[model samples]
Target: MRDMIHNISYCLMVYGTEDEEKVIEALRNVIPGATPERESAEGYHGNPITVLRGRLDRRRALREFMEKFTEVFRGRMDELEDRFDENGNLFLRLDKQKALEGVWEPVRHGDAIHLKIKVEAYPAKREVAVENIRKIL
Candidate 1:
């Protein structure tokens, strides 16, 4: 994969549980080589979170992974910022430490299982990347 826009990353987070293995397996379904890393027991805002980080440079691959990731949890996209250039890409910046208006659904329910996956996309124009950030609900 050629380097594009620094690097594209997908961070899948599993919250309120110690089951890192499950999250790892889940992410691997999208990207076979996704090796999840274990953070502090209470890594995510005092709640237990197991996060998996991986790199994807191409737009097609990124889109496919995002689709599969959302499908895994029946996720619905909402509040995607209109932050885009002429290119076919929508950018999103989320601070896990703070409450966010725009969020990925399906993992909203907070029982014993809470999952949130964030995929970062960047660069290139010509194609309108309109559908890339639309609400999936």
Candidate 2:
């Protein structure tokens, strides 16, 4: 299962009122050595927002990420089953504050770092992807 994952994409939203550098640091804690692409946009009330995004497609990086993720969330691995999509992608949200503190925890709320992992599965189905991912975990 060395190539179980095709790529991993991460995104984070930094509000104008928040500290951008801190948010970026939080993302780095999970992705490691990533140089995120930045984009500026407007919020609901026309407030400025910054979007930081990154992707990992290399085999070594993906493997390392899986190792860290599994190590951090081993006890909750079963809960991740529902996060897989029909397209064979796994979705996750890591708490921004926890990440900044060097803690890796999955979250359901909006103030988070969003992660999408394209799982490599036969027939490209969610169930197949989940089964394969479980093997790795």
Candidate 3:
């Protein structure tokens, strides 16, 4: 089985060759770069998907994550600097599903600053996969 954890990727389009090794190295030193890995799909899916995560080692990243988490869904809260709000409290927060779509941003990515991310997880890949899925029940 794969040793996985709840993850968040900061994706960007590279300009050159296929060098995930070097990219992973660059991330290790990044203030909060997630572990990078090169992945390929050949069975049902034909194209390759770049996979990585955003390392969480600071407050700013956390705040950005939570707020962005809510907004990307449909522009909820302005920021994730504060605690979660009470339910049906008028103000809207990040829509878990939508928030999961867009990503985070940092200065390190340079021109490839396509997107950034700050994901919250409990180190359990199983739990993380439990997205805000629809329930027919």
* Residue lDDT tens for model 2, 8-103: 998888897798888888988888877789999865467788888888897778878888987886667687989999989999998989999999
Worst 10 residues of 1 by lDDT: 97-106
Model 3, position 107, has a per-residue lDDT of 23
- Report the lDDT of model 1 for residue 69: 44
lDDT of each: 0.43, 0.85, 0.32
Per-residue lDDT value at 47 in model 3:
36
- Write the candidate numbers in order of decreasing TM-score: 2, 1, 3
| Global lDDT of model 1 | 0.43
Name the 10 consecutive residues with the lowest summed lDDT in model 2: 41-50
State which candidate has the highest lDDT.
2
Rank the candidate models, highest lDDT first.
Answer: 2, 1, 3
TM-score of each: 0.40, 0.90, 0.27
RMSD of each: 8.6, 1.7, 12.9
TM-score, candidate number 1? 0.40
The residue pairs that clash in candidate 1, if any, are 87-125
TM-score of 2: 0.90
The per-prediction tally of clashing pairs is 1, 0, 8
| Candidate 3: residue 55 lDDT (0-100) | 34
